[PDB]
Design a protein around this ligand. Structure first.
Ligand code: FAD
Ligand code: FAD
Lengths: 356, 368
């Protein structure tokens, strides 16, 4: 059977890859794959709503083997680091949220080591002395989404998946899509995973797909020749600080309701620099190498949108908002199953399209 | 006669242009003209400031350049058929606390004797001239006859003009000064040589680093790093070149006609480093958003960093060296765009007459 995946960010690429891994034939339609939210994304993979939590822990459990399998097929690196994740808090408010977080994670078998202010500074010398304590998640990490999507693209190629670099301009009642150049592509199944543009595809029957509203996020990248920070760090007052091996240090992110605007603004960059310098005062001399902005794919109730629509053979896989890099593997596994079996794995039932 | 100008930022391009205008033949040596401090520069053309209070000679140099700027630009656009991006809509000096409002009183008294139009403005009048100022504005001064230039457009014109008048541009690095010959010259990185009747060094903070210079000839032109940024809106955000002071620190806000808004600048001692840093950009954004809170929505379009050419005593270095037929024209530090015209006029005279105009005597090389 043949599945057409509309949109090729981290969510359609992963989905398309796993569909191939399950012996399906796959076409991905996207004029510029891995160019949007997935391009600017930080790739923090923090452990962290019961249903969503369960979805995240499953994706978490799966991440290591997902990456292993992907590198094997692709002969490429996905840039997955498992050096643990440091949660650092700097005031009463934030130190209390850590207690809540640690209590939320103990029952579920997630390694979480509480750290007092001192222990925090020993794990990360570059933290400001105002640090009040933290949590260490030694089994967690972070990925470089740019490397992850590059691998997904390589793997999809190796397995003979087709990539069409054109815009899907219309959905056709088997299902298919019209492309901007006039050519058409039908398949046995169609999967929409076009981020915050999913619901904007002309020809979708009213009510089929809910509004995947964009949530803007500005983000920046600093650099030093040698890495500045020891490991993926969350500093709460939340700012995400993700060191790459080559000296890049990602700093995200703003969360904003600005429709589809992706302008990098004085306000946003000032917000981010303010946070990083408050908790990493030595970051003052790091080079500001990049500033960017992307759109998170939302949903009317803030949770992912996975499974069948009321339109036969039309599925969706979107609305991962703040954590799609994190949810990418489980989403891929889940949609694989759905396509092959016709049934919806238990862990995904909460995110059916029909709930609206 | 033939003059070789080493270095082609705003100071050698202007100098070279005026030398041509005076019928000299001119060669400019610079691998990438107008690429350094002159590229990042804001182009504020302020009359005077706290810095000139205890510096009568420099003040006199600045006021002369100020007087000359309008006609300099007129003459340059005429020769070049190009715009230099000189705006004369006046300059707004805005203050935001007691400290800064008092410094304005001092500044207004400093400028009245020198024939500089300066209109005091109360907090209300400030907000009427510039609606985007924060409501904490405490009062200002308007300098209606002052303005600002876009250095990028100014150097483009200088380059066009120099071309039109048959000046030669050699896009190579001068690697060595050739001393002790009938005439002075420079060796280039590609091995070719260029002599002239006069040589003028105007290579910013690299001037003193040219191999072959006799010891003591040129003093240390030490770099002073400055980061600067550019914001943008489709329609202009700020009405005119604005200086805002608060909490004992200043920021320059220079609107261009196309919506670009320049915001400078940091002053830092980092030798020759021109890295744009988290610290520097945070400094600048902090200042602009404090006094222009609406600037939060503006696009951050560009960040940059440049090296100001300094001098052992902080004043320009103009005139002859102890090496015969070897002149210099550098060390303008924070205000070379402002001083560019007068510097050009002055060096023209020096080359043609052999004498040093009175206004420039204070900046002789030999003072060290
Ligand atoms: C600043 C920022 C930081 C983030 N940090 C993290 C983090 O640290 N950890 C984490 O887990 N998550 C993070 N996220 C979230 C995560 O990056 C996103 O949820 C995820 O990238 C969504 O993937 P997606 O493929 O659904 O959408 P996208 O990556 O936006 O991909 C959608 C694709 O659809 C395509 N498309 C659009 N219209 C059409 C059409 N008509 N035809 C064909 N194709 C089309 C586009 O070209 C695009 O490539 C972050 C997001 C942002 C904005
Ligand atoms: C951030 C910042 C903001 C500023 N804002 C203002 C302002 O608002 N108003 C104002 O008046 N001034 C301002 N200035 C000052 C102004 O930018 C400088 O004083 C002026 O640029 C000095 O220019 P210059 O031509 O001497 O040197 P530069 O512009 O540095 O030019 C020197 C040139 O020499 C060339 N060169 C170097 N070595 C060699 C070699 N061996 N052979 C050949 N060529 C060589 C270089 O390539 C370069 O093009 C600012 C400066 C900075 C850094």
């Amino acid at each position: 059977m043949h599945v057409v995946v509309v949109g090729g960010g981290v969510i359609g690429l992963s989905v398309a890859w796993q569909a191939l891994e399950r012996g399906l034939r796959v076409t991905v339609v996207d004029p510029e794959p891995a160019s949007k939210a997935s391009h600017v994304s930080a790739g923090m993979l923090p452990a962290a709503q019961e249903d969503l939590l369960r979805l995240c822990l499953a994706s978490r459990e799966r991440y290591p083997s997902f990456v292993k399998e992907l590198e094997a097929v692709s002969g490429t690196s996905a840039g997955y680091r498992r050096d643990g994740v440091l949660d650092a808090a700097f005031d009463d408010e934030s130190l209390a949220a850590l207690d809540g977080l640690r209590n939320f994670l103990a029952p579920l078998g997630v390694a979480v080591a509480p750290l007092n202010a001192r222990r925090c500074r020993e794990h990360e010398p570059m933290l400001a002395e105002s640090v009040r304590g933290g949590l260490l998640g030694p089994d967690d990490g972070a990925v470089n989404p740019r490397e992850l999507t590059a691998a997904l693209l390589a793997a999809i190629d190796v397995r003979g998946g087709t990539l069409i670099r054109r815009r899907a301009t219309e959905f056709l009642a088997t299902p298919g899509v019209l492309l901007e150049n006039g050519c058409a592509v039908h398949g046995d199944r169609v999967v929409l995973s076009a981020g915050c543009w999913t619901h904007r595809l002309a020809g979708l029957p009213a009510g089929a797909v809910p509004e995947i509203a964009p949530a803007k996020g500005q983000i920046l990248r600093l650099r030093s020749a040698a890495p500045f920070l020891r490991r993926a760090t969350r500093a709460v007052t939340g700012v995400y600080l993700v060191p790459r091996t080559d000296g890049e240090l990602v700093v995200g992110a703003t969360y904003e309701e600005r429709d589809y605007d992706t302008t990098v603004t004085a306000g946003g960059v000032a917000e981010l620099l303010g946070k990083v310098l408050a908790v990493l005062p030595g970051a003052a001399e790091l080079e500001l190498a990049e500033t960017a902005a992307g759109l998170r794919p939302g949903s009317p109730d803030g949770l992912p949108v996975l499974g069948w629509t009321a339109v036969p053979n039309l599925l969706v896989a979107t609305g991962h908002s703040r954590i799609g890099v994190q949810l990418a593997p489980i989403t891929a596994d889940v949609m694989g199953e759905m396509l092959v079996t016709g049934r919806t794995p238990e862990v995904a039932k909460a995110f059916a399209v029909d709930r609206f």
